[PDB]
């Protein structure tokens, strides 16, 4: 049946020493709470109730889902209190899954299992067996069945021997939750309303608590400081790297590899050390990526070789292109089949034609360059006049001599040969050798300066 | 006496998800099977019998040894069957060592010990003691002596307690192997011919099986997927890094260091984080290599400093040169004693003289540059006319002003001073200040464009 | 009361295979012995007695403290002998703390605790409990109190069960040390004078030995080869990275982060993988540093973004500057608020004004550039005439067209527009569009060369 999610994002997060709300800090390039939001929507949540206490301006600036429902916890009185704020929105006939904005790696797979295990009228509980369960609340079981949670402060010498502890994540019916939440009190040392009281309520009423466990302990790890965040980052990258390796991408060093987004890949891709893939990256068959590349939101066709230390953002390479080492492709970079870009070359909103080469020390901006063109070393498209951008068009089979300047808007015909060092301001018709040059003069007797 | 090797390379390798035969995937820049081939030749194998079942085109394209003998296993019926295919080539009077194309790190040292331990008429067996020997066949021993291998499926509760397991690697006489292999049958669940049946044969005939162990467990690790390959890569690099550190190379971070080939080094070399050394690299005394360099098939003389993010392939630096940061030396790059190459500079088939400097934003291709030359920033040798490469020659003690173009073929004399921005097409005689320049004109009243 | 330190630096260090004295090899960019020297001065040592046996030229070249006292150990006869050489300099009324030039990570905190625990007339001893104390001398205790050190060679079956071992570091009164050191003998297998004999002396005289332990085992780790040095490097960097993370700097991968010096940082700094910080680095609030940057002795104001693979040494960025990717800032680089430096750009002794941009392929050396200037792509300040450096001055609101050359000394007025490809040699007055250009000529019928 229908189901909605409450994401708790209400801690102060002081141990982050941050002006950014804690659950907005990123993991693999996406905010922690966004991981949870995405899981809930993958589960098909009808609504996502985000309960926050601070930083509502910044949260609302960053999170936009058509089904996101914002719920202020006006005071920090505990997770049970936080649920009481969302409770007026639960439907009686829907399940309500409770999640944490700072436990980002919880998986859809685990949550689907939790949801299946919730007994009617009862509670599904996500528990984990720890080697050292000190501090955590222990799950009590009599003749196989769960009966309650005992906090560590109140556990007996023999109770503190249970290794199964409560993760805080749970699922239950909307109408039942409304019933339990209303009965919550706060007579205790901290004066808080603890959500775990509802376990005892359900048990005393005659209903069942069924527990399931995550596949990986990392799925239920929480983040309160940046050391915990960085450790979770490494765990997640490691898991991604293993999946890629097993699926048939060769990562030379999986510990020196980062994916912050998504990867579609062909067969026989090889990725060298210290590559960062960001956004949505698409790699064809037999793409080779060299040491140190950063590739963001780009598509790289079959058989391309990206040499070391290239930076690619929002670019398109067709099959069999070679870029780098030290190539810088910016949004709108576009290489046709078999094109080459060398070292210290920058492209921005620029198309390099089929089999065309710009091998050295070149800036191509706002340009359409034809097929079988040789952009000589030191060439620059002057696309900026101080106020507006202008376009440079080069035809098919053009030789642009080393250190040429094209002052856009300029069109260059097919078969043109532009001489070295020359400055191009007006158009050039087909097959015109064009040049703008002064012959060298030889001065006799010049004495070179001295200190 | 003489000895030959069988390398088994006959698995399907499906779990690699590859169009490249599995044993051709590289480890430290060399195909796995090539590691094994090299060990066998270091051992002095008279012949290397490579038994394959698939991918013979690609194997024969990649492997070339004058003593390599290709043996098709026409069907995948087990390692015992694979040996029966090589068996018609064994000489009676030679030992036959059996190796695996996907167990690349087996060492010459271990194999020499195995060979010494083979009893006459008997079998030398390579066994390893595992913390968890589950699945592997256990070595049985009575009063010290080996008597058989018990597969894990057929081991008793107490048998599964042996931690010594069969690695599959073994050595025995040619004529004995021919005798045993012929007696192999395939009445079993898998219908295969298992090479380990010959252990029981030798024992029942009255001959001995003597076992030895590898030094490191990694020596007998096999690769069936790219996760196993990547883990073996890290293990191997780590071992190489330790040897280099103990021999007196300072690696700032041995976990961020890769050698894919060989290194000869002097005293007091320092290598910073994330350096990749490929091919045959030779480093003099007191070479300093900065963060991120990639150096392939190059020789770097005493006291050179390679600053961060330089890429060097097939280059020669004499003593006391400085290149980088962001230097790109390509094949034929050649620096004489005390020469300097700065940032965003590229050399290809180019010699920079004794104490000569090209510090910024320069391409030198197909050039011989004299001693005490200052290649100004932005200089470019135009060596390519669209069809053929041409040569630029600069003499001793030449000042090439910033942003000069040399249109090869051009010779420049000694003591020449070339002015900034000038274009050089014809030769220049000694001490000629040469220039090609238009005086700047000052326009009054120009209004700069607007959006 | 007063206190002085003896640093033992007298080993041969042969296992380093080095021409540099062992204690001078660096850890986090500072010589090992300098770590110890700095701890001793933090403790307020009145004198630091450095006892060496070899390499005195190189030591004295590298170490300079106004309170450093050089003490030759003329022969390698043991640490007790080494102390006898420093002993003539101890004052009766001061404590003498004994340290080791090759145990670099010993902390001021631990040493302050050791100093507090020295009983009057007695010895403070630094001991550590090891999981495997094999080889080390065991601390003996009767009814809580220390009584002696038993070397491992002379320990009983039950003695070798003590896990508390002597680290060699100790503190005692000057006059007592002079008394004990004089009574040292060398009747033993090695013929050496062992400093640990003084423990028995103090005990037999009726005085106490009180022991304390380091916080971390790494604090008392010694370096005899470069593998041990590299492992200590990683341990130290890891500890620094944790402190930074907990203090609120986001390191994307703390294992790929190196600080060789000091860091002052604001709130919400983010540092990506493979960044090296050297010397004294100051980062403002919300600085973002990209993958691979190296930043040395520089100050980077609030909100700057340093894109990947930039190298910064002795630079100053004001608030809100953007440099990189592939930026190279050299000493004297100076960016005012909101300035931008793009890819393949180099600055040296150069100031880029408020909101000024040099985005591509540019060298700015010895230049003062005004506010709201656009340095076009390919621009070069020719500051070097072969003998002396010269200065280029550009005013406010100047458009320097792509591939311009400024031949210093040149002043450029405000509002100047310099055309593309032009060469500037004489000054330019305000609002002068300046240009130096030849119109392009179009040759008919030119046949391009062929192989
Ligand atoms: Cl590479
Ligand atoms: Cl460095
Ligand atoms: Cl990045």
């Amino acid at each position: 049946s229908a189901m909605s999610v409450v994401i708790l994002a209400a801690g102060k997060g002081t141990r982050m020493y941050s002006d950014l709300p804690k659950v907005l800090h990123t993991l693999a390039g996406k905010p922690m709470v966004q991981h949870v939001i995405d899981a809930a929507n993958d589960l098909g949540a009808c609504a996502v109730h985000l309960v926050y206490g601070h930083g509502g301006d910044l949260l609302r600036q960053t999170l936009h889902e058509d089904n996101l429902n914002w719920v202020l916890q006006a005071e920090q009185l505990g997770t049970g209190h936080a649920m009481q704020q969302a409770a007026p929105f639960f439907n009686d006939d829907e399940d309500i899954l409770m999640l944490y904005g700072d436990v980002p790696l919880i998986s859809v797979e685990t949550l689907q299992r939790l949801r299946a295990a919730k007994p009617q009228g009862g509670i599904g509980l996500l528990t984990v067996k720890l080697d050292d369960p000190t501090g955590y609340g222990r799950i009590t079981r009599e003749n196989g069945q769960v009966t309650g949670i005992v906090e560590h402060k109140d556990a007996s010498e023999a109770q503190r021997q249970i290794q199964e502890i409560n993760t805080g994540i749970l699922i239950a019916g909307g109408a039942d939750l409304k019933r339990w939440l209303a009965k919550l009190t706060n007579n205790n040392a901290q004066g808080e309303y603890y959500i775990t009281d509802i376990i005892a309520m359900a048990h005393q009423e005659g209903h069942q608590i069924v527990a399931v466990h995550p596949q990986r302990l990392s799925e239920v790890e929480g983040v309160n400081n940046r050391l915990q965040l960085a450790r979770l980052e490494r765990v997640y990258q490691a898991e991604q790297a293993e999946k890629l390796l097993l699926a048939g991408v060769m990562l030379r060093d999986p510990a020196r590899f980062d994916l912050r987004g998504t990867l579609q890949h062909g067969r026989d891709v090889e990725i060298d050390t210290n590559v960062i893939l960001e956004g949505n990256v698409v790699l064809g068959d037999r793409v080779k990526i060299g040491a140190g590349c950063v590739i963001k939101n780009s598509t790289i066709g079959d058989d391309c070789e990206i040499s070391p230390y290239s930076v690619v953002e929002d670019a398109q390479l067709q099959a069999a292109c070679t870029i780098g080492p030290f190539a810088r492709l910016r949004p709108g970079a576009e290489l046709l089949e078999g094109a080459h870009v060398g070292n210290f070359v920058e492209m921005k909103k620029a198309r390099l034609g089929k089999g065309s080469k710009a091998g050295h020390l070149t800036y191509l901006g706002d340009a359409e360059i034809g097929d079988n063109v040789n952009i000589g070393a030191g060439t620059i498209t002057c696309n900026y006049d101080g106020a507006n951008k202008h376009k440079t068009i080069i035809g098919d089979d053009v030789f642009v001599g080393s250190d040429t300047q094209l002052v856009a808007p300029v069109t260059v015909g097919n078969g043109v040969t532009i001489a070295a060092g020359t400055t191009v301001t007006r158009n050039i018709a087909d097959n015109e050798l064009v040049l703008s040059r002064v012959p060298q003069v030889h001065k006799q007797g010049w004495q070179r300066p001295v200190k």
Side-chain angles (χ1 to χ4, degrees), chain A residues 171-348 350-388 390-410:
Chain A
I171 181 147
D176 293 327
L177 271 176
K178 292 192 250 183
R179 186 172 70 257
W180 297 326
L181 292 172
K183 295 180 204 268
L184 282 180
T185 64
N186 59 329
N187 316 312
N188 55 75
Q190 299 279 275
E192 308 191 351
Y193 301 79
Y194 294 103
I195 186 65
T196 73
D197 289 6
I198 74 177
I199 303 297
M201 294 179 196
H203 187 256
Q204 183 62 234
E205 295 185 321
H207 307 109
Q208 264 75 64
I209 303 98
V210 177
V212 304
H213 319 292
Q215 272 182 311
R216 307 161 293 278
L217 318 94
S218 68
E219 284 185 80
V220 301
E221 289 272 356
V223 173
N224 300 316
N225 62 50
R226 303 179 195 237
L227 177 64
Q228 296 173 340
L229 183 48
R231 283 170 175 160
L232 209 46
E233 180 81 28
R234 271 324 99 191
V235 164
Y236 180 80
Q237 291 299 333
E239 299 174 344
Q240 281 195 333
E242 274 209 26
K243 281 142 166 293
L244 290 172
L245 281 156
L246 288 174
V249 183
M250 190 60 210
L251 315 175
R252 287 302 157 197
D253 192 355
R256 293 180 280 170
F257 171 75
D258 295 86
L259 172 70
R260 303 162 178 180
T262 65
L263 183 63
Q264 309 312 296
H265 57 79
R267 297 198 116 211
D268 280 332
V269 181
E270 309 166 21
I271 302 183
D272 212 341
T273 69
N274 289 324
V275 175
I276 305 178
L277 299 186
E278 305 182 327
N280 304 130
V281 178
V282 175
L283 307 185
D285 295 320
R286 294 174 302 280
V287 179
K288 293 208 209 65
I289 306 185
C293 298
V294 180
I295 304 166
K296 188 191 187 179
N297 289 324
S298 297
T299 303
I300 300 180
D302 287 353
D303 293 293
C304 295
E305 298 180 353
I306 288 72
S307 283
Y309 304 118
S310 307
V311 178
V312 177
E313 190 181 13
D314 275 298
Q316 294 255 309
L317 285 60
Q318 302 270 69
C321 307
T322 58
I323 77 169
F326 305 123
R328 207 282 179 97
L329 299 183
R330 306 179 66 199
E334 208 186 328
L335 279 64
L336 300 190
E337 188 171 2
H340 167 71
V341 172
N343 47 29
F344 326 118
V345 175
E346 168 188 12
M347 294 178 77
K348 177 192 90 66
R351 199 178 69 254
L352 191 56
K354 284 174 186 177
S356 293
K357 320 221 225 54
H360 342 81
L361 290 162
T362 284
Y363 170 72
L364 308 167
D366 285 279
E368 302 179 325
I369 307 180
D371 302 337
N372 296 113
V373 165
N374 202 260
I375 302 306
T379 306
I380 284 117
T381 54
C382 321
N383 57 330
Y384 185 57
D385 65 1
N388 313 290
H390 300 270
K391 192 163 176 190
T392 318
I393 291 192
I394 300 188
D396 300 313
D397 305 281
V398 174
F399 181 88
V400 184
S402 276
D403 216 294
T404 305
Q405 299 79 51
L406 302 105
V407 189
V410 174

Side-chain angles (χ1 to χ4, degrees), chain A residues 4-11 13-128 130-152 154-156 158-211:
Chain A
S4 288
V5 172
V6 178
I7 301 172
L8 261 54
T14 40
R15 280 320 211 249
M16 302 280 293
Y17 300 113
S18 182
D19 294 305
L20 187 67
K22 174 176 71 182
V23 299
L24 290 178
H25 289 246
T26 64
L27 199 161
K30 173 199 278 180
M32 284 194 298
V33 76
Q34 189 69 56
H35 289 274
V36 183
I37 288 163
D38 287 346
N41 285 339
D42 288 329
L43 292 172
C46 231
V48 178
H49 307 289
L50 189 40
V51 182
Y52 65 99
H54 87 285
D57 283 9
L58 284 175
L59 290 166
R60 289 183 294 268
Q61 276 179 234
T62 304
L63 312 175
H64 316 297
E65 319 286 327
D66 301 359
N67 70 334
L68 204 58
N69 181 45
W70 296 94
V71 178
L72 171 68
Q73 190 186 29
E75 184 155 333
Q76 292 307 306
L77 291 173
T79 56
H81 186 255
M83 292 289 293
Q84 286 174 325
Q85 313 309 303
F89 304 100
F90 306 166
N91 299 87
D92 296 336
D93 306 324
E94 64 169 349
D95 287 349
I96 304 289
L97 170 67
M98 188 182 181
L99 298 179
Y100 294 83
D102 58 351
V103 180
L105 296 196
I106 180 62
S107 75
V108 165
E109 201 286 343
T110 284
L111 294 172
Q112 261 163 357
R113 271 190 300 109
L114 179 63
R115 197 181 174 190
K118 176 213 73 163
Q120 185 82 347
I123 297 168
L125 189 58
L126 180 68
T127 73
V128 73
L130 294 182
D131 270 338
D132 182 0
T134 291
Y136 302 93
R138 318 308 173 95
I139 306 303
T140 80
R141 311 182 94 115
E142 282 80 351
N143 299 323
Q145 279 304 85
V146 173
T147 56
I149 306 174
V150 176
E151 285 311 319
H152 179 85
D154 331 322
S156 73
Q159 275 183 329
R160 303 194 181 184
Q161 310 287 349
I162 312 271
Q163 302 191 305
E164 190 188 18
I165 60 102
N166 168 46
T167 71
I169 290 166
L170 62 73
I171 181 147
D176 293 327
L177 271 176
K178 292 192 250 183
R179 186 172 70 257
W180 297 326
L181 292 172
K183 295 180 204 268
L184 282 180
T185 64
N186 59 329
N187 316 312
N188 55 75
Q190 299 279 275
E192 308 191 351
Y193 301 79
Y194 294 103
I195 186 65
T196 73
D197 289 6
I198 74 177
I199 303 297
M201 294 179 196
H203 187 256
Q204 183 62 234
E205 295 185 321
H207 307 109
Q208 264 75 64
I209 303 98
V210 177

